[PDB]
Amino acid sequence: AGWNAYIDNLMADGTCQDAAIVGYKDSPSVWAAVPGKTFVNITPAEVGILVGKDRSSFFVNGLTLGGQKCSVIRDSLLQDGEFTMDLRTKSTGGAPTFNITVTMTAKTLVLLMGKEGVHGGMINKKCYEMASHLRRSQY
């Protein structure tokens, strides 16, 4: 309810192409996402891996978000005051790859995907700031 307003903000400057707010407690589900893209299709199983105990194997095997294959660049998801994970999509046949940052709040995972050529640091900072805003409001 009203959660798509946060998506609108994340999508406002035009450098990002996808975004989602996913609750990870109890039964995971997408609270808001960009219709027609990738994050909207995120499954509870994919959410279980992001917040999982094994935080090594995915550096070798990669992971999927909405069925899209990704490689993990750095993981500080469960690190207090840091809360981020930087990823990059894995493409095939000349398709462009995009940078993604996932930030954990008290109840959600804020995922953001940049457009082609957009630096991961910019994506990381934007995702982190939205996550902190939510965190301050107890989400």
UniProtKB/Swiss-Prot annotation:
Q: Which residues carry this modification: N-acetylalanine?
A: 1
> Which residues does the record list as N6-acetyllysine (modified residue)?
107
State the encoding gene. Answer: PFN1
- What name does this protein carry? Profilin-1
Oligomer and partners? Found in a complex with XPO6, Ran, ACTB and PFN1. Interacts with ACTB. Interacts with VASP. Interacts with HTT. Interacts with SH3BGRL. Occurs in many kinds of cells as a complex with monomeric actin in a 1:1 ratio. Interacts with ACTMAP.
Taxonomy, superkingdom: Eukaryota
Is Secreted among the key words of this record? no
Function noted in UniProt: Binds to actin and affects the structure of the cytoskeleton. At high concentrations, profilin prevents the polymerization of actin, whereas it enhances it at low concentrations. By binding to PIP2, it inhibits the formation of IP3 and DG. Inhibits androgen receptor (AR) and HTT aggregation and binding of G-actin is essential for its inhibition of AR.
- Subcellular location as annotated: Cytoplasm, Cytoskeleton
Species whose genome carries this gene: Bos taurus (Bovine)
Recount the PTM note: Phosphorylation at Ser-137 reduces its affinity for G-actin and blocks its interaction with HTT, reducing its ability to inhibit androgen receptor (AR) and HTT aggregation.
- Crosslink Glycyl lysine isopeptide (Lys-Gly) (interchain with G-Cter in ubiquitin) sits at which residues? 53
Print the organism lineage: Eukaryota, Metazoa, Chordata, Craniata, Vertebrata
Read off the InterPro entries from this record. Answer: PFN, PFN_euk, PFN_sf, Profilin1/2/3_vertebrate, Profilin_CS
